[PDB]
Design a protein around this ligand. Structure first.
Ligand SMILES: *[C@H](C)[C@H]1/C(=C/c2[nH]c(/C=C3N=C(/C=C4\NC(=O)C(CC)=C4C)C(C)=C\3CCC(=O)O)c(CCC(=O)O)c2C)NC(=O)[C@@H]1C
Ligand SMILES: CCC1=C(C)/C(=C/C2=NC(=C\c3[nH]c(/C=C4\NC(=O)[C@H](C)[C@H]4CC)c(C)c3CCC(=O)O)/C(CCC(=O)O)=C2C)NC1=O
Ligand SMILES: CCC1=C(C)/C(=C/C2=NC(=C\c3[nH]c(/C=C4\NC(=O)[C@H](C)[C@H]4CC)c(C)c3CCC(=O)O)/C(CCC(=O)O)=C2C)NC1=O
Ligand SMILES: CCC1=C(C)/C(=C/C2=NC(=C\c3[nH]c(/C=C4\NC(=O)[C@H](C)[C@H]4CC)c(C)c3CCC(=O)O)/C(CCC(=O)O)=C2C)NC1=O
Ligand SMILES: CCC1=C(C)/C(=C/C2=NC(=C\c3[nH]c(/C=C4\NC(=O)[C@H](C)[C@H]4CC)c(C)c3CCC(=O)O)/C(CCC(=O)O)=C2C)NC1=O
Ligand SMILES: CCC1=C(C)/C(=C/C2=NC(=C\c3[nH]c(/C=C4\NC(=O)[C@H](C)[C@H]4CC)c(C)c3CCC(=O)O)/C(CCC(=O)O)=C2C)NC1=O
Ligand SMILES: CCC1=C(C)/C(=C/C2=NC(=C\c3[nH]c(/C=C4\NC(=O)[C@H](C)[C@H]4CC)c(C)c3CCC(=O)O)/C(CCC(=O)O)=C2C)NC1=O
Ligand SMILES: CCC1=C(C)/C(=C/C2=NC(=C\c3[nH]c(/C=C4\NC(=O)[C@H](C)[C@H]4CC)c(C)c3CCC(=O)O)/C(CCC(=O)O)=C2C)NC1=O
Ligand SMILES: CCC1=C(C)/C(=C/C2=NC(=C\c3[nH]c(/C=C4\NC(=O)[C@H](C)[C@H]4CC)c(C)c3CCC(=O)O)/C(CCC(=O)O)=C2C)NC1=O
Ligand SMILES: CCC1=C(C)/C(=C/C2=NC(=C\c3[nH]c(/C=C4\NC(=O)[C@H](C)[C@H]4CC)c(C)c3CCC(=O)O)/C(CCC(=O)O)=C2C)NC1=O
Ligand SMILES: CCC1=C(C)/C(=C/C2=NC(=C\c3[nH]c(/C=C4\NC(=O)[C@H](C)[C@H]4CC)c(C)c3CCC(=O)O)/C(CCC(=O)O)=C2C)NC1=O
Lengths: 159, 173, 249, 162, 98, 172, 159, 159, 159
């Protein structure tokens, strides 16, 4: 969020306006809660990918069906690896406080990648929704709100 | 082993080695009245026994549709017939449990080594207990019937029947 | 050709007398006998329960049933001991069990179904696994039904059954027709997604997931190598007597 | 599973002897016919979509009540017609599977094993499927000895139906 | 210099809805597209200001700097006012509007 | 028991599609090379008993304590035990070349082999020194042309030797 | 195809180059075959929608399944009406000779429409593939090639 | 071996002398035997590393001894991985026909690497000798000679 | 945890507290997961003990030095048996929930014992720490927190 304000005041010839300094000071204050939320999502990664695959393959069985992409153990392992990647990028966005280092690695060219891989993007969005539900069950209320923030950004991005 | 309501209250009474108390005989006296109701009730399950299994198989496979799609373990035709034979064996021993009145004959056949074969074969064990619950939803719907039977309170008996399915789903999942 | 190696038998239930006839429970099986005919319901029960031991109930089906051997049993031309040989040396049983299982596990699965006892140790399974290889599978099934433990306990005209399982799981239920090592080849654990979740965090996947390099890839090779080094010499360094230890020329 | 190469093995394995010329001779015979059997596989794979919808609308002709009677088993509902092309489309797969295998094995293991158990429970009359397979064996357009080749396995599924 | 959609599929969908209508013209649209957060991430953020001037000469005027006096004046303008002052001094010119 | 013909069915069943035309062009080459495959198989089985003792002139001469007093090939039943199943390697390798795929061999011949060979006490690694000596004699007979029309069966020779290498890997 | 060459030479200040005049003369020559192909697809529409619904609901049963969109008679009637619309646009593209008047009405914003309707786009692509197969059975070889041209454009567009 | 003759004639201002062209033609002729030898050493790698570890730890037990470097499962796995690396470089040198692409990756700085790792170089030379013995048992006479060529180069290089 | 709660309510004159009955209820609820952890540790007995002992000899070479206690095959076998005993007591403590089985079988008089045996205490403790690290790598993450905290009791109580 510091790079955001820096390039924001850098396109202008002005310095960083002190309201931006206030938002940087407030983010610096909230960084400890951000780090605890990121570590709580970090250590419980196995559980979240399991429950996300659970809720997704209960929701959409066509990836399980042989016409779909995630058919067989190798393809379903690649599917859960994709969900692991998106959980990792969500933890990066939780620490960074703003969605730039997660959009730069997971969002900015995802539609043409998944189009030329054959997979539907709506099933990936449902998988990140299942990750958001499982992390909402894993965390407290003020933590699940702030995690569902960036999970919500990914779900809106994949659609 | 095969035990009963009548024989299990003997078997613990043998282990303590005392004569049967009068309040145990008043307990067993309650059972005799209950038995007539049960026979009428258990006859309804066995007469609709084949109608339950396919109507559970209209949902056991429709809810998890990869199972009969190519790749699933219910795909080919003897694999599909394999499931039906086993599905009724749940009903074959649950009806033995309601007849005996105690689940000690249920736990030697459906609950003993069933969770071991179901990881040796490769079948989903949890995909059984989604549909044994669908049997229980249809079994207690038939047993609790207002037609052709003089109304008698069967709620006390019904609770025992519902549970046997929950024991049948717990040791598979 | 070669005689059986001697294997040690473990103590199991059925090596014991179990005196008396009027004393055993209800749960000993019905000892269906072709000599007892009296009806066709006994005739159909003898055929159906003889399929029960061989195909574990679910398979009997329609197609698997050899209708001509059951055609014969009613006539009485072939004994029940001959009739189990027709079911066991049948390729409807070969595709079902024999191809699918292993020579070491086939010894375990056919003793529970034809002799009604589990194998004692692994050495018994090791012993008969050779008799399968050189004589063939039907040569070994012939050797099981010719064997004197069969004829003494069952006889010529009695369908098999589990002998004395007072406190044990039923043998068609505890043993499938194929075990876990073969499970990927006959089953469909590859295509079902429920098992690949279990597999994902399995220790075997972490050895697969690592890139080329690391000595954890060669950790299974390091256990098979062995050849550990000798310890340091007990003799004290000080005595060594280094001044007179050097040899001239 | 049943294959002329497999049947040479399982015969020689149960005797505990090597491969004689009698097991080896059997393999030689299979090759002459396997050249004409793979001709029959391409004839059914290329005409696959014409043959399925050619069949599932031919069974509706001889059995018009199957689209009218309201039942789970019946194909009158769209969901039945969706499961119509699945089931008849499953048949042409296994027929093409048993063509290239040379034996009836894949037909024996995937399709007809336990078919009397399933058709009794779901009340699917086997007179329906035999009417579709008679349409396939007359409308595949295959010629020569390859026309004989698909005609055995179709008729082998007919006899196992009834 | 390469189409941002069909290749990455991210673009401003707010301004297309005005150019299709006719609320802002093309000389206004190029101006509102250059001083934008999308253009800054690819051309204003990697390069030094003296290379940014030449690339904004290629993007808007469609040519490279013609004289030393040209880059002196336009460096003074981008210096005193950031990138939006350079975009405004470039889009409004005689060489653009002719 | 699987094949080349049946294994390209079995994965094609798991994906549930019709067989493609380039799979049928693949199997058409399998039929085309079938005659060559048959010839190789008959030469191995006709020299089957001659291979085993000629491997036993080196399996025991190279590790000579094995038949010397103390080794596990010492007494006479024990010696006839490693000729009763030296040939079972050849009994199932010839089944693998006939089927054209090593799935038949894996199920019976090598599935439980490495477990018994530490239960008995036999050296497991002293088998695969001589199964390699079988492969050196098997591909020498299968390649040599005696009273045979000239042809090139080189592909079979390398994947005939791949079946022996699979037969040596799961014992050692 | 005349508007294509006209705006193509109109962005330039040059006239229509006479190679473009040659392609217009050749399209003018082939217009009679185009009109016969369009009339043959015109009069046989309900057969094509019937066989397309046949092959689609045999291929993908999830639209039939109650979680899918085309569940019930009203939704399946809307589904076959969508297939009727796409057959109509294919006949327009067959007459026009170039895919502009069919992309302008059926392609250019279809992904966000079907996304905010809930329907998957791959099932629509399979439906147009079934329309192409049925029209390939209905027409001769040189007619089915030239129809499968524009049907192929729609199938590539919906993906 | 072509780069050798090319830089050899390239230091001079002369062309490639036709005796060098004869040696390139002869290497081109022998390349098929080189490829068969390399594939035979390729597919049987784990046997060769097993027998090399066998013969080495029978020969020198100090790496097994806790004062030595290869003590424990992790260190002995790294040891067999080093032997795997050297077998891989030997196959590269067998294909290339001359010892340049194997010396460039395994020889040219190995003494200071193994000195600052603590391991003795003579044990590595004995390990490559064990690899040469096992590959001599694996191959025919004219193949074992031509493999023991490059194995001999590695054994001379590590000393 | 039942024995400790009963003796703690035995020291007072009163019954078991509602808090303590909540403790027993939560222990019963977590007991099945504790049996799963005991299942994994029972089945991984060999390689855990060997990896931990070899990690100990990597860290502390004084014991296998010839002046040390664990010099020789028999002495080092008894070393690995001691590590086996401590892993067995750790499994007992994971199952029971108390540390009273760990304590009154292997903690309470171990200092005087290893003083009279000549064995250093800190090397035992480092070996149990190696067991903690190995069993932490084998198990699930917060499951490894559970196992390693009983291991942590053994490590802190040995020193
Ligand atoms: C059904 C919902 C699922 C399913 C069933 C299925 N099971 C098998 C194979 C076996 N089933 C059993 C079950 C029992 N044996 C017992 O003794 C009792 C209590 C009396 C039970 C419930 C056993 C032992 C087997 C092994 C083989 C046998 O039939 O004797 C199959 C066949 C699988 C195969 O042949 O590999 C099937 C289809 N599997 C599913 O797909 C459903 C999810
Ligand atoms: C961190 C940024 C990042 C992303 C986003 C990413 C995606 C990604 N997904 C892939 C495959 C895949 N992705 C999926 C996806 C899915 N399964 C489904 O059914 C759903 C639609 C979805 C997940 C629930 C599948 C099935 C494959 C295998 C497809 C194939 O093999 O063709 C592949 C190719 C195989 C690989 O190298 O992993 C990439 C690169 N990689 C990255 O590095
Ligand atoms: C083994 C063969 C056999 C059967 C089947 C049998 C059943 C049976 N059920 C009876 C009664 C009854 N059965 C029921 C059962 C029920 N009513 C409800 O509304 C409930 C839903 C349901 C229980 C769940 C009731 C209420 C009665 C009333 C009379 C009584 O208490 O027995 C009676 C009393 C005598 C008679 O009806 O002539 C008979 C005979 N008797 C037999 O000999
Ligand atoms: C040849 C080696 C060998 C042995 C030893 C053997 C033992 C054996 N003991 C059994 C039972 C039994 N064994 C006992 C024994 C005892 N009760 C006591 O209090 C004493 C301490 C103890 C005897 C000294 C009892 C009471 C049973 C019956 C338990 C039951 O049915 O619940 C059974 C099950 C029933 C049967 O006898 O068939 C077997 C198989 N089997 C063998 O093959
Ligand atoms: C891979 C080989 C294979 C085939 C072919 C196969 C067919 C098969 N079709 C079934 C049902 C069905 N089969 C049909 C098909 C038809 N009914 C009609 O009305 C039409 C006349 C006809 C189609 C032309 C229908 C509609 C059902 C559902 C019936 C019900 O649910 O009761 C069932 C029982 C339930 C199920 O899992 O869906 C099986 C096992 N199973 C197999 O493993
Ligand atoms: C931020 C405020 C804002 C609005 C609202 C806005 C609207 C706007 N709506 C337009 C077209 C349109 N607007 C509508 C909307 C509607 N027609 C209906 O039937 C419905 C009643 C209604 C939708 C709820 C439609 C259908 C068109 C398409 C006309 C066409 O492009 O051919 C256009 C023409 C060019 C274009 O979309 O890209 C503009 C500029 N611009 C703005 O800057
Ligand atoms: C069909 C696949 C198959 C194989 C291969 C197999 C091998 C096998 N070899 C065995 C024994 C044996 N195996 C050997 C073989 C050897 N020992 C030596 O000294 C030599 C180094 C080596 C031969 C090169 C000998 C001599 C025995 C008898 C050992 C004994 O009786 O203790 C045994 C245990 C006893 C037996 O029944 O004969 C088995 C199970 N079993 C199988 O089912
Ligand atoms: C099952 C009984 C049976 C056998 C044994 C059999 C073998 C057999 N091998 C043949 C050909 C052949 N077989 C070989 C084999 C080889 N040439 C070499 O130089 C290689 C070393 C070797 C392979 C490793 C060749 C090269 C031909 C040439 C003709 C052809 O391609 O079939 C043919 C062609 C027809 C003929 O010869 O009359 C026959 C009959 N046919 C049978 O029906
Ligand atoms: C000519 C240009 C044009 C297009 C493309 C078009 C699409 C279109 N599809 C619609 C609905 C629909 N479209 C479908 C589509 C399908 N059924 C499926 O399962 C498949 C995914 C797919 C066809 C095989 C369904 C199921 C609905 C009803 C959805 C609802 O009611 O929410 C609707 C809303 C209802 C209506 O007013 O018709 C529109 C506007 N309309 C147009 O004017
Ligand atoms: C392909 C070119 C290449 C070479 C040559 C190479 C050597 C190499 N050997 C290493 C370690 C090692 N190398 C050995 C070596 C041995 N065990 C012994 O006792 C013998 C002396 C010898 C082998 C038989 C040992 C024991 C270690 C671990 C030493 C340590 O952890 O400090 C390491 C550090 C750990 C690693 O990242 O693998 C490198 C980089 N790496 C390369 O990429
Ligand atoms: C269940 C609780 C329990 C423990 C802990 C226990 C330890 C124990 N360790 C012993 C010896 C030993 N223990 C060690 C231990 C070690 N080597 C080191 O340097 C390390 C620090 C340590 C490995 C952890 C050694 C080297 C000996 C042999 C000493 C001797 O023989 O004099 C002995 C005497 C020989 C024996 O009976 O095995 C006992 C009883 N016994 C028990 O019942």
């Amino acid at each position: 969020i510091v790079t955001k304000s820096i390039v924001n005041a850098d396109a202008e010839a002005r310095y960083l306006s002190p309201g931006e300094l206030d938002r940087i000071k407030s983010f610096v204050a909230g960084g400890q809660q951000r780090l605890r939320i990121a570590q709580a999502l970090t250590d419980n990664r196995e559980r979240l990918v399991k429950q996300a695959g659970d809720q997704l393959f209960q929701k959409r069985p066509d990836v399980v069906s042989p016409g779909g992409n995630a058919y067989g153990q190798e393809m379903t392992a690649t599917c859960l690896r994709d969900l692991d990647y998106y959980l990792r990028l969500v933890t990066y966005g939780i620490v960074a406080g703003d969605v730039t280092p997660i959009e730069e690695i997971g969002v900015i060219g995802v539609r043409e990648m998944y189009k030329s891989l054959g997979t539907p993007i709506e099933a990936v969005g449902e998988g990140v929704r299942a990750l958001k539900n499982a992390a909402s069950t894993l965390l407290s209320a003020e933590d699940a709100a702030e995690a569902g923030s960036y999970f919500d950004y990914v779900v809106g991005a994949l659609q | 082993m095969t035990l009963d309501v009548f024989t299990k209250v003997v078997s613990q009474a043998d282990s303590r080695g005392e004569f049967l108390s009068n309040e145990q005989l008043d307990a067993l006296a309650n059972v005799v009245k209950e038995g007539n109701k049960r026979l009428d009730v258990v006859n309804r399950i066995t007469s609709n026994a084949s109608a339950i299994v396919t109507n559970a198989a209209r949902a056991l496979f429709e809810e998890q549709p990869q199972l009969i799609a190519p790749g699933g373990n219910a795909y080919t035709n003897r694999r599909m017939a394999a499931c039906l034979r086993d599905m009724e064996i749940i009903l074959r021993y649950v009806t033995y449990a309601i007849l005996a009145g105690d689940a000690s004959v249920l736990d030697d056949r459906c609950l003993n080594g069933l969770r071991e074969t179901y990881q040796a074969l490769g079948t989903p064990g949890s995909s059984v207990a989604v549909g044994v619950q669908k049997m229980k939803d249809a079994a207690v719907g038939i047993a609790n019937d207002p037609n052709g039977i003089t109304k008698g309170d069967c709620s006390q008996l019904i609770s025992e029947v519902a549970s046997y399915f929950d024991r049948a789903a717990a040791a598979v999942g | 050709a070669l005689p059986l190696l001697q294997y040690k038998p473990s103590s199991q239930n059925h090596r014991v007398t179990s005196f008396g006839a009027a004393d055993q429970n209800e749960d000993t099986p019905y000892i269906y006998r072709i000599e007892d005919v009296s009806s066709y319901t006994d005739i159909q029960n003898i055929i159906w329960a003889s399929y029960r031991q061989v195909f574990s109930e679910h398979e009997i089906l329609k197609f698997n049933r050899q209708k001509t051997l059951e055609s014969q049993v009613k006539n009485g031309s072939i004994s029940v001991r001959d009739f189990i040989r027709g079911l066991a040396k049948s390729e409807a049983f070969y595709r079902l069990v024999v191809s699918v299982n292993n020579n070491y596990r086939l010894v375990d699965i056919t003793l529970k179904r034809l002799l009604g006892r589990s194998s004692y140790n692994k050495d018994e399974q090791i012993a008969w696994s050779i008799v399968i290889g050189t004589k063939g599978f039907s040569g070994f099934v012939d050797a099981l039904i010719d064997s004197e433990e069969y004829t003494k306990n069952f006889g010529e005209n009695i369908v098999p059954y589990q002998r004395k399982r007072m406190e044990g799981r039923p043998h068609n239920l505890v043993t499938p027709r194929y075990g876990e090592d073969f499970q990927e080849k006959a089953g469909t654990v590859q295509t079902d997604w429920r098992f690949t979740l279990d597999k994902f965090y399995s220790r075997k996947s972490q050895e697969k997931q690592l890139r080329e390099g690391d000595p954890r890839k060669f950790a299974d090779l390091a256990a098979s190598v062995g050849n550990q080094g000798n310890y340091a010499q007990r003799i004290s360094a000080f005595d060594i007597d280094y001044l007179n230890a050097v040899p001239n020329r | 599973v049943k294959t002329p190469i497999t049947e040479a093995i399982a015969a020689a394995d149960t005797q505990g002897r090597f491969l004689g010329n009698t097991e080896l001779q059997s393999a030689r015979g299979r090759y002459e016919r396997a050249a004409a059997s793979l001709e029959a596989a391409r004839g059914l794979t290329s005409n696959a979509q014409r043959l399925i919808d050619g069949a599932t609308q031919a069974v509706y002709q001889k059995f018009p009540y199957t689209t009218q009677t309201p039942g789970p088993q019946f194909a009158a509902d769209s969901r039945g017609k969706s499961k119509c092309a699945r089931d008849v489309g499953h048949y042409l797969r296994i027929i093409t599977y048993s063509l290239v295998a040379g034996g009836t094995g894949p037909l024996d293991e995937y399709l007809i094993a336990g078919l009397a158990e399933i058709n009794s429970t779901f009340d699917l009359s086997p007179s329906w499927y035999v009417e579709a397979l008679k349409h396939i064996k007359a409308n595949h357009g295959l010629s020569g000895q390859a026309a004989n080749e698909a005609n055995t396995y179709i008729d082998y599924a007919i006899n196992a139906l009834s | 210099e390469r189409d941002i959609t069909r290749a990455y599929s991210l673009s401003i969908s707010d301004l297309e809805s005005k150019v299709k209508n006719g609320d802002i013209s093309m000389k206004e649209f190029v101006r509102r597209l250059a001083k934008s957060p999308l253009y800054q991430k690819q051309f204003y953020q990697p390069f030094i200001n003296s290379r940014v001037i030449e690339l904004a000469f290629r993007h808007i005027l469609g040519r490279g700097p013609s004289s030393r006096e040209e880059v002196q004046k336009y460096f003074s303008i981008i210096s005193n006012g950031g990138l939006p002052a350079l975009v405004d001094a470039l889009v409004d010119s005689a060489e653009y509007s002719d």
